[PDB]
Design a protein around this motif. Sequence first.
Motif, mmCIF file in Angstrom:
data_model
loop_
_atom_site.group_PDB
_atom_site.id
_atom_site.type_symbol
_atom_site.label_atom_id
_atom_site.label_comp_id
_atom_site.label_asym_id
_atom_site.label_seq_id
_atom_site.Cartn_x
_atom_site.Cartn_y
_atom_site.Cartn_z
ATOM 1 N N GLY A 45 6.621 30.977 50.998
ATOM 2 C CA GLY A 45 5.504 31.199 51.904
ATOM 3 C C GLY A 45 5.215 29.955 52.724
ATOM 4 O O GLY A 45 5.258 28.829 52.218
ATOM 5 N N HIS A 46 4.917 30.154 53.994
ATOM 6 C CA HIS A 46 4.569 29.020 54.847
ATOM 7 C C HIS A 46 3.256 29.264 55.590
ATOM 8 O O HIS A 46 2.988 30.422 55.916
ATOM 9 C CB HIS A 46 5.696 28.741 55.851
ATOM 10 C CG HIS A 46 6.999 28.436 55.167
ATOM 11 N ND1 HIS A 46 7.094 27.608 54.072
ATOM 12 C CD2 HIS A 46 8.257 28.868 55.410
ATOM 13 C CE1 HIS A 46 8.346 27.526 53.669
ATOM 14 N NE2 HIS A 46 9.077 28.285 54.473
ATOM 15 N N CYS A 112 2.624 22.292 55.742
ATOM 16 C CA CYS A 112 2.495 23.540 55.004
ATOM 17 C C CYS A 112 1.903 23.229 53.633
ATOM 18 O O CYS A 112 2.388 22.328 52.950
ATOM 19 C CB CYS A 112 3.820 24.265 54.844
ATOM 20 S SG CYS A 112 3.708 25.561 53.578
ATOM 21 N N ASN A 114 1.699 25.135 50.919
ATOM 22 C CA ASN A 114 2.225 25.827 49.732
ATOM 23 C C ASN A 114 2.745 24.789 48.747
ATOM 24 O O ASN A 114 3.353 23.794 49.167
ATOM 25 C CB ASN A 114 3.316 26.803 50.147
ATOM 26 C CG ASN A 114 3.866 27.633 49.011
ATOM 27 O OD1 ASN A 114 4.589 27.116 48.153
ATOM 28 N ND2 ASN A 114 3.531 28.915 49.014
ATOM 29 N N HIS A 117 5.747 22.201 49.050
ATOM 30 C CA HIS A 117 6.181 22.288 50.434
ATOM 31 C C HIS A 117 5.807 21.117 51.321
ATOM 32 O O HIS A 117 6.622 20.631 52.106
ATOM 33 C CB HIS A 117 5.571 23.581 51.016
ATOM 34 C CG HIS A 117 6.289 24.790 50.493
ATOM 35 N ND1 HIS A 117 6.799 25.791 51.288
ATOM 36 C CD2 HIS A 117 6.582 25.151 49.222
ATOM 37 C CE1 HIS A 117 7.372 26.714 50.522
ATOM 38 N NE2 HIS A 117 7.255 26.347 49.254
ATOM 39 N N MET A 121 7.786 19.844 54.489
ATOM 40 C CA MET A 121 7.210 20.526 55.644
ATOM 41 C C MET A 121 5.957 19.838 56.189
ATOM 42 O O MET A 121 4.858 20.208 55.772
ATOM 43 C CB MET A 121 6.831 21.964 55.293
ATOM 44 C CG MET A 121 7.781 22.630 54.314
ATOM 45 S SD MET A 121 7.953 24.379 54.663
ATOM 46 C CE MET A 121 7.618 25.129 53.080
HETATM 47 CU CU LIG Z 1 5.736 26.272 53.267
#
Ligand SMILES: [Cu+2]
Length: 128
Positions: A45-46, A112, A114, A117, A121
């Motif tokens: 998920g992002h 991000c 998550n 992440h 990210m």
């Molecule tokens: Cu992500």
Amino acid sequence: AECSVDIQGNDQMQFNTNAITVDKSCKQFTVNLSHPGNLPKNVMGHSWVLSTAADMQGVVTDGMASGLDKDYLKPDDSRVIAHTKLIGSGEKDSVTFDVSKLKEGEQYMFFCTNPGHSALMKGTLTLK
Ligand SMILES: [Cu+2]
């Protein structure tokens, strides 16, 4: 496509850009995020969040502590300048924010939230 950007989060935990640029001229700037791939929300998920480089880690940590049910983000988190929703493969999301929020001398990052992440990210956002 002035005052806006098209950014992707993929299956290998990467955005397609680490440097975003905001034209000073814009009253508002919009980020369109999409997720190419086939991995779903609970697996890859992002989301896109924006904050000063300094507030980033508190935002990631309390976000992480804001479960998958809250899109891994402290609701109404004051250090969050703007944010999209958390998304999985095939899905899209967008957000528009007030350029005036971007202040001077400030360092901004996008990331991000998550779990696992944000390290990879992330990139800078600069008001040019
Ligand atoms: Cu992500």
